[PDB]
């Protein structure tokens, strides 16, 4: 539990430092120094765009990995006595893997709207570019997180159903609906990811 203690300590120390520096800044009538606008402006939109793309694919793939292993261990454990489940249950596995696919194609579409800048100043050069970069970063974060979470849900449900199949093999069809509901929830995530970056111009 030492790692948990270290993480909690870092969390609480950083948040205490942040609240104390905020109260010091607002007390000392030094509000103008704590400029969020300058941070969001002078920062390059390319970092936001590329980080959004990377997270969009990476969260998807790691959620899919969580699902596939959390269901594969269950399958291999429950398949010792009944070898027939070693393949028939696979219909609930590809979901997770297909969930990861919902990232890469998505990771293409956002990446389809990346252009160079050849500009440095932020005054009237980059307003639409700023919006495009932030919007595509948000869409990437949305798809990545939603896809990861739906992957872990689908893997959990698939492991449960696979262990259910170990006793009565006739309930798999009656129980298939939950994981397709989870996959549909991932589809909602991908749909809103599409819509968020639907109308954005980059350049």
């Amino acid at each position: 539990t030492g790692l948990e203690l270290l993480y909690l300590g870092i969390f609480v120390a950083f948040w205490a430092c942040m609240i104390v520096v905020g109260i010091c800044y607002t007390i000392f009538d030094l509000g103008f120094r704590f400029d969020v606008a300058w941070f969001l402006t002078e920062t390059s939109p390319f970092m936001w765009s590329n980080l959004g793309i990377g997270l969009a694919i990476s969260l998807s793939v790691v959620g899919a990995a969580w699902g596939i292993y959390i269901t594969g261990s269950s399958i291999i454990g429950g398949g010792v006595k009944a070898p027939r489940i070693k393949t028939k249950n696979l219909v609930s596995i590809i979901f997770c893997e297909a969930v990861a696919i919902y990232g890469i194609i998505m990771a293409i579409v956002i990446s389809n709207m990346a252009e160079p800048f050849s500009a440095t100043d932020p005054k009237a050069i980059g307003h639409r570019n700023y919006h495009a970069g932030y919007s595509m970063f948000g869409a990437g974060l949305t798809v990545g997180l939603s896809n990861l979470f739906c992957g872990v849900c689908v893997g959990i449900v698939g492991s449960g159903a696979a262990l259910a199949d170990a006793q009565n093999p006739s309930l798999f069809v009656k129980i298939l609906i939950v994981e397709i509901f989870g996959s549909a929830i991932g589809l909602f995530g991908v749909i809103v990811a599409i819509l968020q970056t639907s109308r954005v111009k980059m350049g």
């Binding site: 390059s44 390319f46 970092m47 765009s49 590329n50 980080l51 793309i53 990377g54 997270l55 694919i57 990476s58 793939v61 790691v62 899919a64 990995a65 969580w66 596939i68 292993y69 594969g72 261990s73 399958i75 291999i76 454990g77 398949g79 010792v80 070898p83 070693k86 393949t87 696979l90 596995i93 590809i94 893997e97 990861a100 696919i101 990232g103 890469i104 990771a107 293409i108 990446s111 389809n112 990346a114 160079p116 800048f117 050849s118 440095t120």
Partner: protein, 150 residues
């Protein structure tokens, strides 16, 4: 107009792409080695039969290495800060993809190694599940390659 510190992002993109994949491969190798050692105490003839999770981790490490080599060979002094962020994003993506793939590879390989030690007929089915793990890591690689140009 070339901004300073531009190569920093690409350098850590390559470093992450190598390192995270290396860590995932190491975890997979460790878990599968523990599983093999546990299983070999009763079925000695089945040692080389299911050594393949180790080579799967090696494959993930190979994906990390090839992405890192490509990114490093694409590195120049005057990065326009548009290529560097692309390289960093691809590197981080492929690195965490390799980490997750190694995670799944290790866990499922240990489980399947124990199962095939217990039930000899379970190996081939395990194959399918295990192979899917690599695919996930593979996705990182491809999503890096397209990110190497656009």
């Amino acid at each position: 107009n070339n901004p300073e510190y531009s190569s920093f992002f690409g350098v850590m993109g390559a470093s992450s792409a190598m390192v995270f994949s290396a860590m995932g491969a190491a975890y997979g190798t460790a878990k599968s080695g523990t599983g093999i050692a546990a299983m070999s105490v009763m079925r000695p003839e089945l040692i080389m039969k299911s050594i393949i999770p180790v080579v799967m981790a090696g494959i993930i490490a190979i994906y990390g290495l090839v992405v890192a080599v490509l990114i490093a060979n694409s590195l120049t002094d005057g990065i326009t800060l548009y290529r560097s962020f692309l390289q960093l994003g691809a590197g981080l993506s492929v690195g965490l993809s390799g980490l997750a793939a190694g995670f799944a590879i290790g866990i499922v390989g240990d489980a399947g190694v124990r199962g095939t030690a217990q039930q000899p007929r379970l190996f081939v089915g395990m194959i399918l599940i295990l192979i899917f793990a690599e695919v996930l890591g593979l996705y990182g690689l491809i999503v890096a390659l397209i990110l190497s140009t656009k």
